[PDB]
């Protein structure tokens, strides 16, 4: 019964591929030929937030566009002030190997997760001023690779368990588990309406999840190596992926296939972080070649370069108003660009 | 008024930076060790003696120097991604079960995972302290002669014991071949890539061996000294 069901799977995959090709009547490289290029995006480091002792693995902006959280392998969860390069909180973690961190859109809480298979929620706006663990969301049998705060006490955590999860922080038990990925789920990106999220894994595939229902609404193939980063288009109708393939692909939730491929022949290094600008016109991609490239999200041309990091660029982040681009790296320095 | 709140920000920053200095003095003083191994590779015993005799986290202290050992547990067997977390680690302690049988070539499985650690472009400066475990269970296997490594390694029959051999009392020539032949299968990978950046310090241990906590301390001094000696280009 296995061979016949494998036959069913292969013919249904071929049917989906033909239905995608029937929808593939053009590309952005043909429609955006009448689109003027953005020129050279020459962004300069405005601030260098230093104080971290080890590699900076994660970084996330607050909704106010002032406060960052940066997670580093030394066991620190530092809250920065991006305008005055001042540290607001230095949260020591129980596990030094923190692989992700998130800043709650309400500003009250901050998460972090790594090799301890636990997503720890810290309460910043506490009655005594002591930044203390609020919850420890245990239950994953794999390392925590990316956790994103949903609004109403919910958090979408992605693990190396090949399984995502939506946790109810107040109780501490996950209400939904998103399964279907065969490789380590590496990165998340919540849509602007926080009703759908997309997951990147080491299966070279991206999956569109319904966070309220728990089903994989859509599986995006086309990448060739481990999806290391994922990010939504600002309108929530498209998303960009970065992999070890050394290319960025732009999938559309409606077109159900690739829109653009962001690659360069002199680029052979894996892409660790991907972001978008407020208009979604600039695709910021962090690389292993120690610099970020400012891709034209509509033309696949390298409009600029954010160079100046002495090690691998591990985490990118655009402010919610788009006023700056933060780039954390394994050199323990988080640089703000504009 | 904003002057008072901005100076309170400065004062909180000063407190935070004083705490970060006090924490960095402990960070760069403790040595981080990633403890890897295959399935039932005998590394569990190595955890016990480094824990009691003076992922999961192990802090021990030998010669007043603090060491942190991180046994990666409750993780899958796809070490592709979280092994990038271990670049600041001074030494990846690789425990190989030299006599895993008497499932399916656990030595070649460990050899290929060993080959992928050096060639990993992020572990291209992390040294590997190699504990070839179960040297006592490898003894009874080869001197009996019913289960050979020659069927898993044809180049063993054409392999003669090296001149750098230091056999323990009771190590007949039939075992010091298998003892040292395995060591040179790992050194064939340790020398064919990345010279001067990382170094392999292979060791022969067993469940009855107790100074394994000093072999890592002696070779973590060697790792740090070689890291300093190449900062001055003296090495």
């Amino acid at each position, epitope marked *: 019964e296995l061979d016949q069901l494998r036959q069913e799977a292969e013919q249904l995959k071929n049917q989906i591929r033909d239905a995608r090709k029937a929808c593939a009547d053009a590309t952005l490289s043909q429609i955006t030929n009448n689109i003027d290029p953005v020129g050279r995006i020459q962004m300069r480091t405005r601030r260098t937030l230093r104080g971290h002792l080890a590699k900076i693995y994660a970084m996330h902006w607050g909704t106010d566009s002032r406060l960052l959280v940066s997670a580093s392998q030394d066991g620190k969860l530092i809250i920065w002030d991006s305008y005055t390069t001042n540290k607001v909180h230095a949260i020591p973690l129980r596990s030094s190997w923190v692989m992700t961190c998130a800043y709650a859109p309400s500003g009250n809480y901050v998460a972090c997760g790594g090799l301890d298979n636990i997503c720890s929620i810290y309460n910043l706006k506490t009655r005594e001023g002591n930044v203390r663990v609020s919850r420890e969301l245990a239950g994953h049998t794999g390392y925590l690779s990316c956790c994103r705060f949903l609004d109403d006490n919910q958090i979408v955590t992605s693990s190396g368990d090949t399984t995502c999860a939506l946790w109810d922080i107040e109780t501490g038990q996950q209400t939904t588990t998103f399964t279907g990925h065969t490789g380590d789920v590496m990165s998340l990106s919540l849509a602007p309406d926080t009703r759908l999220f997309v997951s990147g894994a080491c299966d070279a595939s991206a999956k569109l999840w319904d966070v309220r229902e728990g089903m994989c609404r859509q599986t995006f193939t086309g990448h060739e190596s481990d999806i290391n980063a994922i990010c939504f288009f600002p309108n929530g109708n498209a998303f960009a992926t970065g992999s070890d393939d050394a290319t960025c692909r732009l999938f559309d939730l409606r077109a159900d296939q690739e829109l653009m491929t962001y690659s360069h022949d002199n680029i052979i290094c894996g892409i660790t972080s991907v972001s978008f600008s407020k208009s979604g016109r600039l695709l910021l991609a962090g690389y292993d070649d120690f610099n970020c490239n400012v891709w034209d999200a509509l033309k696949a041309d390298r409009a600029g370069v954010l160079a100046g990091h002495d090690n691998r660029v591990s985490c990118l982040g655009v402010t919610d108003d788009g006023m700056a681009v933060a780039t954390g790296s394994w050199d323990s320095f988080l640089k703000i660009w504009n | 008024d904003q002057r008072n709140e901005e100076k309170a920000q400065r004062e909180a920053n000063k407190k935070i930076e004083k705490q970060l200095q006090k924490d960095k003095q402990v960070y760069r003083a403790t040595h981080r060790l990633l403890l890897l191994g295959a399935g039932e590779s005998g590394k569990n015993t190595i955890v016990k003696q480094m824990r009691i005799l003076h992922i999961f986290e192990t802090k021990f202290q030998v010669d007043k120097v603090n060491f942190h050992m991180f046994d990666v547990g409750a993780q899958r067997d796809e070490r592709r991604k979280w092994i990038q977390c271990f670049n600041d680690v001074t030494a990846i302690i690789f425990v190989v079960a030299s006599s895993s049988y008497n499932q399916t070539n656990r030595l070649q*499985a460990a050899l*290929k995972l060993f080959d992928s650690i050096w060639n990993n472009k992020w572990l291209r400066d992390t040294s590997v302290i190699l504990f070839l475990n179960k040297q006592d269970l490898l003894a009874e296997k080869v001197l009996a002669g019913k289960s050979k490594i020659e069927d898993y390694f044809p180049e063993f029959a054409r392999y003669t014991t090296p001149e750098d051999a230091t056999p323990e009392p009771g190590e007949d020539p039939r075992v010091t071949r298998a003892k040292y032949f395995i060591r040179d299968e790992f050194l064939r990978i340790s020398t064919a890539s990345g010279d001067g950046r990382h170094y392999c310090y292979p060791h022969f241990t067993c469940a009855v061996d107790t100074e394994n906590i000093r072999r890592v301390f002696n070779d973590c001094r060697d790792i740090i000294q070689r890291m300093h000696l190449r900062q001055y280009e003296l090495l």
Partner: nanobody
Amino acid sequence: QVQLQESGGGLVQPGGSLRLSCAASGFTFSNYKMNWVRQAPGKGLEWVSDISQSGASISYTGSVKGRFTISRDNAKNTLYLQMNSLKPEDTAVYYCARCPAPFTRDCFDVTSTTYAYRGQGTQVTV
């Protein structure tokens, strides 16, 4: 879509010869290191033989050296495993796998239990 379907297996008598063709599709074949793994009855995934991007550096598991030989055709995006002088121990489902990242000497997790870029395997019974 990284698709790795394989053919050429089947039943052969001890001492025979077999050639498994690994038709790779969905990833530029010349960019990434390739290898064969096999799962003998008894629940064990073992690596068989490595081959670099250009096909210059070829390694083998000890039990199959000198009797197994692999080539790669970067033009047709195919990988071969010529299996000479087979033994009844060689009974296994042979999976054609590629390592996870191009331009890397490291070959991670090809022998993992649930690897993503590993073929569906062909059964070779001796």
